């Protein structure tokens, strides 16, 4: 099950990622992390075509924030099933 | 129904944009979201013509604090309801 | 009740700010905030003129602090009830 | 057991990372530390061959990441005891 | 009982900073703040003759610190009891 | 009891620093501390000859490390016993 996920600098920008991500496919949004600097993301899970479908919508509907940013973004098709039990992409 | 933010750099601009949207229309306070380099944001809930009043005035009311600045701000009319249970935009 | 806050860069500095506000009226402190960056906000709350006092000796009284600077400072007569449930302005 | 790391400026790249490592050979990824200022480190367990030839692929496919980079990596082979009670390259 | 603090960037520093504060006076360091940003400071309680002689000697310490930084410091005679209950400065 | 301390930009390099450390002389590697912008120090105890064996081997294996950089490194030959109770520089 793929993952995709949006970086943003700034937490409004962020929830816009959100949004538009699980409004644009079939995709469930699973998580979002903080890592400091004001970066934060939101990852979805779903299949690769949806999920691709996802972030790039979000990244385009992001320009309708004001001052928000994208920093970075990135889809895995597949990921291995150890990702699921340290890193936080997994269905809670 | 709709959420608004608003995210500032430093503390007392975020209490002057939670207590001039919540003063401004039928908007709650729902939340306020620290994610590091001093930014912080303060999320509402209501009716989106209300949400849209609250923001307004947050940003305007925000010059009037000494050293305040506003990074970013946006409403989101409707959003999805998988955002409720991933993100701290509740009640 | 009204609310006034300082918000220095570095500790020492707003132990100051929460020392002259207590001393210079008729305020509580009722909170200490850290948002990051090393940005730090003192809170006090009291009637409006004696918290209008006391922010204003705050903010003098932080260039006795060696490497002490303000970054922001503000009041609010009046807050919204809803603020004292979500932020941290509340008599403890 | 050796032990391998690669630290990242952002999230998404250091999943790749991860994703990358587990994939390349038989580690295992054991960690992930955030330090702040966007920097974050996964880290996996493994023979050392096998813990060279995940963080080399690592490092490579963190350059399909937009926005992706990598700020630090390193290997040990025979990391101490001692490091396992005190730093998060354990289980 | 007055308090003394030595913020400095880096944490051997501020190791340097309380070490030399307990030793160069009869006070007790009483806590250790981390504000983010890698500003750290050091918290001691004592008479202000005492503070004021712990502070100085850390100042001049962390000076043989490899990589050491003050970024500020400060001494409060006399702290209002109010911020005993919100500020980390007690005996815990 | 001696205390020694390497700080670092980034995480791999301090895992080397602590490698290093315990693995140059007979020194507990007791903690492990954050204090943002990416800075991160490891903490030995032992025998100030030891110590200091430990800490000169740590900062110059760092220079193996890719990306890696030491910020700051200290050795205090004998900590005050107040220290032991208020910074992590004990035997957790």
């Given at each position: 099950i793929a993952?995709?996920?949006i970086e943003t600098l700034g937490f409004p920008a962020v929830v816009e990622?959100?949004?538009?991500?699980?409004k644009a496919a079939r995709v469930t949004l699973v998580?979002?992390?903080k890592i400091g600097s004001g970066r934060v993301t939101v990852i979805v899970r779903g299949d690769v075509?949806?999920?691709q479908?996802?972030?790039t919508a979000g990244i385009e509907n992001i320009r309708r924030?004001?001052?928000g940013e994208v920093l970075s973004n990135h889809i895995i098709a597949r990921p291995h099933e150890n990702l699921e039990y340290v890193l936080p992409i997994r269905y809670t």
């Open positions: 993952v995709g996920m990622a959100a949004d538009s991500m699980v998580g979002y992390e075509s949806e999920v479908a996802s972030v924030v004001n001052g």
